[PDB]
């Protein structure tokens, strides 16, 4: 045990896991990430055909302008001006709190950070998908296959000097034919290289590798070029919201050579990359309940074939029927990549051993589970839940031991509404969660190697980052014509007086008391949350949803002396490695 | 069939209360088909030695000399429940009778007593009982599944029917007199036996000593059966909406005509309790209200959203 | 061609583990299940008119005690487990806490006591003429099971109990000097002491010849333990040796016994496949029998390491027509493809050809079985597609042709979890589950074993009439097709009658007389067991006539056996003069050989009576009737159909069909009578127990 208050105003025993998680993640990434992988898959500029605005318009998300909104901040006299910003427009960062908001032109449905190697200090991006329409909704049973746009948004570089006056820039997007996208995952390491890397004119310095869970029931694998190399190739007269028709690196689909019968698997619904070097396997969950694995380097003429345009088609090497219904989530163990966990519409969380796929390590029945998080240091999994089957008031977020320690599920955060998305930060050891109630909640996990019942009141370990409300000055137009979004943000700089500050007193009415809206669009619903996986910007978070507005925050209270120490030591080593 | 097979079958067709020796002789005498071996003192000793030498056969001293069997052509039940060894059936003295197996036979099952020695020593206190596997097999027959585990009430139904052999039992008398329960309570516990198919339903007519005649259901175990003469369309769950939102929208699409919980279940493709939770939550958020409607046998509930 | 047979066997529990359906040579099906093994044995029941498959059911219980592998002394292991659990490194700590091999039971973890896999021995391995069941739990308890009485399954031995003790008795290394004992506190050595004794899969050899059989157990480490069993197997006493070999394969997945003959040479070796995809044959030389030989060098059948897991292997003997020689076909399920390899010994040694037959399925294969006679292969996947796959010989090696079977036309939308071809290819057993209803999942999941016809009645009749094995019990799956036709149409189809008469006329061997007895008994059943009664009485007369024929023929063997061996002057075990009387009873006995043989016996026999006594009476039992003996008090003893002695013991051996009875072999019986008692019935060619 350790007594006293940290200078950020949380007790030291509450923060001590958060500080420990930095060291454990650093030791892991030193050993089990890598600096370069898939050396053959460098982007080729001639595969990136820029669409004109005339060609792009069918792919563009149909909302040209955001809903009206205002932003309020704890301790700042209220602004109250109604903003309304175009598609691909960003407001400017608040000069001190650095929150940023920008409009994606539709409702946000996939989101991941581009993984930037430890110490690189690179430009920091999010790749995202936003649905073509604010009110249209797609049946799970059907291969939608309607065209849509993958988007890449540069957030600048999130360095301290850069945060004031920052903006989010829509550097480019990819026109996708293969339906709407349900999940996005980058190759967790080794894809990135320096934007200043000298390469021959057809090649472009690679930003990343990105895999898409298409509603068309297949996975698209792209290598992203750095934007500067595209803009150096692009004629300067072209439209700067550049929309590219991009040839896939590989197309991943369930089948076999000469398999005439199209697979019953239906939509792809969740991805996991193999969390450890050399990231050779990609796993996907399917509507028919299967989990499917592709070995991306595979030379074998039984798994790999090349299309006439030179893109790959990959068939899987292994599948198993993990679930009785659609696999809503995969999470792959970082500490040992033989183990994987999944959740499904049959509302069982199943822990798997991929050496022995016929029997799960453990199956725990639960409420209908929407996303899982598995933080490196902890044996168990944290579950976001739909409330439709929950014992009333016991819904929300639970951490669930894989079972050896045998603790009860730690009821980390009660929620009335269904948490749509969940994200852990391995650097922080903390988790954040987006709700239809419109709060974004973040919470600190105890040292889960010790019995969580020793936590006498978990309310001391969570805080609301913001709540989205509709203010009245069944469809999107009939909503926005009569309501505007109010975003009210906490003072993230410290957690002093937290349990007395009004956002907590408000949040304690969101828990338990809050009567759930069911009679309008749920326009405030937060569909995705992602902490940064990158040591640079490790305290940054991105969120968004039915409003189509992304909002970004810096959890200033959790960035710490060890974070600064670790960033500088990694910066020195990185600068010693690449020159 | 083998004589010694039929010997064990007659023992195993009684329940956990088993047979006394005179009851066994009575059962062998009353057997259909006829017992192949004529009963004689040498036979009764020989059959006693066969029973004594059988490892699954077991022996008890009952606290009372049991009354002999009535001729069954046309027992007090004492159900043993949730037994931790998993043995099932009825036996009034189950906790009060004592095993005398090691006294009747060695560990090598060699008989320590003759039939007349044992019957002199104990009379109708001597009970022969077949082990749980033997008794259950005699109820199942060969073709049913030993992996089946029944509710103990439903096993007691079989054990009553099993000992009743070709004569069977009337569902009237089972609920009225044996189990002393309402017909629905028996019927509910009988339905599983029809579902797994262990028993047969016979329409039967009682003729009273008053001269009137009355219908009843005869029940017979399969071994002994002999026929006596005389629009809402379903919802494909969408990705982008939670299950409450999707279920409320269904009810609002139904509106004033409403929908039942059963039709919610069918339309949502969910389990019974899962549909029950969805209804109760939408009631508890007071976005939906339930209204009663007498349909068929029951006042069903149909649900309407508070917009209507 | 494909039609469902009427009974679908419902299972109480979830089907479980690797390749969970198997059909044994003994015509018993087993389903490895989360709480049991369901065992279904198919009876060609002659006692009832029910046209269905008559299936008798039993189950092996899951063991109630969670199996812990022995890796050290209790106190040392307990400290090591606490060390690895308490370790601050995520990799060590979570590799320990997640890998269930280290944690077979825990506080919250579910006990994984159900069954992983099962493998039937050949016939004749049991204490009786039946076959043994190898059964492996998911917590790695390898057990051998047998069904001594009809009701119970009993554990004959636990091999994980033995093998863990043998390793502890050698400090977990096969040669002490080759690797001295590493400290259990090293997690790599802790893990190794589990991996070297975690069974993956097991398979039985053919019968070696006193009989013997080999069980190979494959471990996670790529070690293989070959157990040698003496036959008949009765328990731990029968374990002759346990020899461990190292495959050198990484992450091994499956075994089969490649076992083959060319001229005088008997060749065998293990064929082994990895989860990473290569396939290799190992020469097992570590056996006692002199008649076998083993492969000269390990040979590799597939090298490519493509990470398609080798999920199942099968192999079948084939006489290749154009190469005019004995060859062997290997097939292996590799992801969604079938690898096939044909092995053909010549002056070049192994000539080898291989390929992948391609496009079979849009999902991985989940089970496979092969017709051991024809080499027809069947493959299946959890989308419910099942595909018949026929080898066609080619001037060199093979080409494969395949065709889908439309299970939707017999079952509707279905998931198929496993298939098993019956021993003569008559039936395909299928585990079935509710399928996708046009893109909607089923709410309730239930597992049912379902049987479909592969062969027509005319093919079954032909393969019975032209049978090479000439044994009814081995062909009862084909016989059930004949039985089904008769019970459906209440007559023997005339071409079967004509051909059987021609076979009886031209050859007359007792197989056809046994076939006549079966056909007549099913015919008697078919007309509800009046002219119908006149026909029943007539057919019963024919049954009695062919009963008498088979009795006479068996008596001829018995009487000859008694004549050829030493005469037991005490007449102890055969009613030899009663047999002679029975063989002079009737003027029908035109067989001069029997008539002189009763002369030779009655010359050789003692003039002293040496009668059999009714033990309840100390009174003679005259050889009064074919089926039974009766004393003067009129109480009755059953007749042994093997030796015609009376069965006066309190226990006696009953044929599977209850058609006939046999005495237990006593220590006072001579070897040749003990060999005569170890034989199928005269009437049904099937186990007497
Ligand atoms: Zn007698
Ligand atoms: Zn027989």
Residue numbers in the entry:
A (entry chain C): 290 to 762, 785 to 890
B (entry chain A): 1 to 74, 98 to 253, 356 to 433
C (entry chain B): 50 to 258, 271 to 590, 663 to 822
Quote the study's own text.
Transcription factor (TF) IIIC, a six-subunit protein complex with a molecular weight (MW) of 624 kDa in humans, facilitates transcription of type 1 (5S ribosomal RNA) and type 2 [e.g., transfer RNAs (tRNAs)] RNA polymerase (Pol) III target genes. TFIIIC is composed of two subcomplexes, τA and τB, that bind two gene internal DNA motifs: A-box and B-box. τA binds the A-box with low affinity and is required to recruit TFIIIB to the promoter DNA. τB interacts with the B-box with high affinity and, therefore, is essential for target DNA recognition of type 2 genes. hTFIIIC consists of τA subunits TFIIIC35, TFIIIC63, and TFIIIC102 and τB subunits TFIIIC90, TFIIIC110, and TFIIIC220. TFIIIC220 forms an integral part of both τA and τB connecting the two subcomplexes via a ~550–amino acid residue flexible linker.
We determined cryo-EM structures of hTFIIIC alone and in complex with the TRR-TCT3-2 tRNA gene. In both cases, we obtained two distinct sets of particles for human τA and τB. Hence, TFIIIC90-TFIIIC110 form, with the help of the TFIIIC220 WH1 domain and the C-terminal zinc fingers in TFIIIC90, a stable scaffold, which stabilizes the WH2 and WH4 domains. TFIIIC110 and TFIIIC90 along with the TFIIIC220-WH1, WH2, and WH4 domains form a rigid τB scaffold, while WH3 and eWH domains remain flexible. WH2 and WH4 of TFIIIC220 are an integral part of the rigid τB-core, formed by TFIIIC90-TFIIIC110 and the TFIIIC220-WH1 domain, and their conformation does not change upon DNA binding, suggesting that they provide the platform for initial DNA recognition. TFIIIC dimerization is likely to be concentration dependent because our MP measurements did not show clear indications for dimer formation at nanomolar concentrations. The observation that TFIIIC dimerizes under cryo-EM conditions should be treated with care because we were unable to evaluate TFIIIC110 dimerization in solution due to a limited amount of protein sample.
